C-alpha cells in the first residue's frame, strides 16, 4: 500500500497481477 | 502484509507488487 491506488487482488488473480506488473517473468 | 494480505481486502499497488516479483 505505498501507492494511493489499489486494486482488489486474490488467489491467482493477485498473483497473476504480480507477474503482469513483473512483465511475465516466468508465469 | 498489506501487499499480499491487504490486498485482497483493501488492495494493493502494482506498483508494490514489483517487490514481490
Do not use: H, K
Not at chain 2, 1 to 21: E, I, K, R
Amino acid at each position: 500500500r505505498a501507492a494511493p491506488y489499489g486494486v482488489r487482488l486474490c488467489g491467482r488473480e493477485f498473483i497473476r497481477a504480480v507477474i503482469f506488473t513483473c512483465g511475465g517473468s516466468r508465469w | 502484509q498489506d501487499l499480499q494480505t491487504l490486498c485482497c481486502t483493501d488492495g494493493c499497488s502494482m506498483t508494490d507488487l514489483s517487490a514481490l516479483c
